[PDB]
């Protein structure tokens, strides 16, 4: 007993997949982190170990490679950054239209505390949308190594 929008969300998600993601120091271009696991799955608790060095980056370039079986009118993300239950930062990134059964690459440019304190204390709540239709919600805990 599920809505029209509920069914469209169900379809998109099932037909969606995160292939890989990299993180480069915008300044140099040196890849600081490449992820293989799909961190877009809701319900699961993901974790990530990222090099401490990154916290001394003024800006970082984040590339996502994903595959969607379903067509999407405007694919965009909302991300809140939580420290010990307190939201510190919110961000919005748009990819736009997605071709059905396409594999797309998405590069976003992103413009401070001690690593000892942040490590394991930071959660990145990620909402996936088609235009203004919430398809999935993901939560990733970050560690600085
Ligand atoms: C989906 C897409 C992108 C992110 C971004 N989170 C991360 C993950 C690892 C390191 C830094 N940030 C989370 C979920």
Author numbering: 0 to 110, 117 to 150
From the reporting publication:
RAS is a major anticancer drug target which requires membrane localization to activate downstream signal transduction. Phosphodiesterase 6δ (PDE6D) has a beta-sandwich immunoglobulin fold which contains a hydrophobic pocket capable of binding to the farnesyl group. PDE6D binds to and sequesters the lipid of cytoplasmic RAS and has been proposed to deliver GTPase to recycling endosomes, which is followed by release mediated by the small G-protein Arf-like 2 (ARL2), allowing RAS to be trafficked back to the plasma membrane.
In the crystal structure of the PDE6D:compound-2 complex, four copies of PDE6D are present in the asymmetric unit. This fragment, similarly to compound-1, also binds within the PDE6D cargo-binding pocket but occupies two distinct binding sites. The second binding site is deep within the PDE6D-binding pocket, where compound-2 forms hydrophobic interactions with residues M20, L23, L38, L76, T131, and V145, as well as a weak hydrogen bond with Q78. Comparison of the PDE6D-binding pocket in PDE6D:compound-2 complex and the ternary complex containing compound-1 demonstrates that compound-2 forms limited steric clashes with the KRAS C-terminal cysteine residue when bound at the entrance of the PDE6D-binding pocket.
